[PDB]
């Protein structure tokens, strides 16, 4: 009927910058593993027991607040159903205590390693303490949001994080079908531990507002008339010549002397580029069709010519120009090309990883254009600008 006051222990949570989520256009293996190493810990620093729980959490649902919250107090990963955890004896979810049988039946103690696994494709969260499997397994949870490792460390505890083999040596070998979390590091920034939804930071007093986050949707990476088809074929020949010049192999030949498989690949690429440009709703570029060869090729000089002796005959740099208003169109075309390439790779099973595991169906560049690396984005922009300049040199100019 009345209210009760007692001394509770302040709690806080930390999380590395890595994000793992599940969606239709998933760029991850769908099953990740991390290891947690616990150093010396005081069992009772204060009157209340130390609060130590490890598990996954949602990117938009689990927003721990220092102080008030659900339950009596000391909100952690088990205080709300937005996150799940395991304290050693009980599996907590939404501030509900449910004991889980363990081979050791021991709480979180020093000189122990905590190993947990989660599957994005099928809802299943499994954790093991010191290598001993735990019968209790979380299941039947919806895949919206992104699951990240998180520890609700207490005031007097010290813990060590082992995201992947690159970051630190694993105490136990990962289970089959589970990959270390170091392969899920975002390319934009290095993986560092940061507080979750923290509104305060240390200031040499640095107040912090809301933190921008990317949802699972962000994690996911026309007709060609014959008159335009001739220009598309000319652009295919020009692109093949430019690629041969850049690579300077039988492919290092002229535009009309390119190998048949190379010519077919160039034609397919030019057709895809023309379809993407037409889908953008740009202006009609069917002008000056006969002026395709207006530019003078520089491959005639020996220095520009390849070592094999063949002259690719590419477009002149001075003659080829790019419209300033077409930069946005070029960037959009490059982004669309990257997206369709990532979708094709995902169709074959390729996913984002820190390394290039081609036999394991892993694409290191399977990221959206917004989240793409600086080098890849610059290369895509340069390729789009070169294509636009080649089209302009052939008399095709559009406003977009």
């Amino acid at each position: 009927l009345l209210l009760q006051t007692n001394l509770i222990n302040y709690v806080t949570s930390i999380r590395p910058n890595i994000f793992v989520g599940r969606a239709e256009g998933s760029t991850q293996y769908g099953k990740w593993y991390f290891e947690v190493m616990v150093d010396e810990v005081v069992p009772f620093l204060t009157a209340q027991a130390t609060h130590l729980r490890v598990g996954w959490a949602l990117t938009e649902g689990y927003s721990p607040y220092p102080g008030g919250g659900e339950g009596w107090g000391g909100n952690g990963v088990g205080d709300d159903l937005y996150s799940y955890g395991f304290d050693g004896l009980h599996l907590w979810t939404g501030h509900v205590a449910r004991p889980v049988t363990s081979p050791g039946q021991h709480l979180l103690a020093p000189e122990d390693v905590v190993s947990c696994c989660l599957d994005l494709s099928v809802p299943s969260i499994s954790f093991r303490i010191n290598g001993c499997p735990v019968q209790g397994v979380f299941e039947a949870f919806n895949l919206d949001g992104l699951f990240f490792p998180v520890v609700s460390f207490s005031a007097g505890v010290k813990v060590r994080f082992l995201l992947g083999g690159r970051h630190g040596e694993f105490k136990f070998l990962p289970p089959p079908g589970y990959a270390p979390c170091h392969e899920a590091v975002l390319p934009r920034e290095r993986l560092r531990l940061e507080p979750i939804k923290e509104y305060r930071r240390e200031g040499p007093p640095h107040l912090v507002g809301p933190s921008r986050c990317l949802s699972h949707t962000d994690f996911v990476p026309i007709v060609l008339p014959p008159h335009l088809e001739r220009i598309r074929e000319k652009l295919a020949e020009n692109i093949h010549e430019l690629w041969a010049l850049t690579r300077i192999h039988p492919c290092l030949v002229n535009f009309h002397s390119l190998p048949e498989p190379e010519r077919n690949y160039n034609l397919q690429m030019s057709g895809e580029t023309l379809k993407t440009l037409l889908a953008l709703g740009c202006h009609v570029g069917m002008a000056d069709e006969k002026a395709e060869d207006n530019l003078k090729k520089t491959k005639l000089p020996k220095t520009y010519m390849m070592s094999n002796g063949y002259k690719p005959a590419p477009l002149d740099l001075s003659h080829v120009r790019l419209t300033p208003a077409q930069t946005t169109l070029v960037d959009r075309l490059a982004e669309n090309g990257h997206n369709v390439w990532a979708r094709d790779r995902v169709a074959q099973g390729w996913s984002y990883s820190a390394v290039q595991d081609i036999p394991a169906r892993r694409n290191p560049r399977l990221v959206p254009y917004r989240l793409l690396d600086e080098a890849t984005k610059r290369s895509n922009r340069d390729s789009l600008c070169q294509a636009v300049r080649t089209l302009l040199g052939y008399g095709y100019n559009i406003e977009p």
């Binding site: 001394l7 069992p43 027991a49 009596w72 004896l89 709480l107």
Partner: protein
């Protein structure tokens, strides 16, 4: 007997014998989660001996099963611990008691 869920393992080499004073640090609480009594906040360890019947019989049995340097959760049915009404103003009648007892040291 009362149920004992070992949160933290103990050596178990020594056990509290009859007539020997025992030192505990308990943090008992009710089923609903609202704590009612604890000896840790008071910073005064509780001292009692087996056979004096000062503590509840369930507490004495748990201490008998208890081991030095071991932390476990001890729950009591209302029959053994404060049957019917008991300790007015603290323990509601017909209410269970869950204790977190731990041996710092023996006599």
């Amino acid at each position: 007997g009362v149920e004992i869920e070992t949160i933290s393992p103990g050596d178990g080499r020594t056990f509290p014998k009859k007539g020997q004073t025992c030192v505990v640090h308990y943090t008992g609480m009710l089923q609903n989660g609202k704590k009612f009594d604890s000896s840790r906040d008071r910073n005064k360890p509780f001292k009692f001996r087996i056979g004096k019947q000062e503590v509840i019989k369930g507490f004495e049995e748990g201490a008998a099963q208890m081991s030095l340097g071991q932390r476990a959760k001890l729950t009591c049915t209302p029959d053994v611990a404060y049957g019917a009404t008991g300790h007015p103003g603290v323990i509601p009648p017909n209410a269970t008691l869950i204790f977190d007892v731990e041996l710092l040291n023996l006599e």
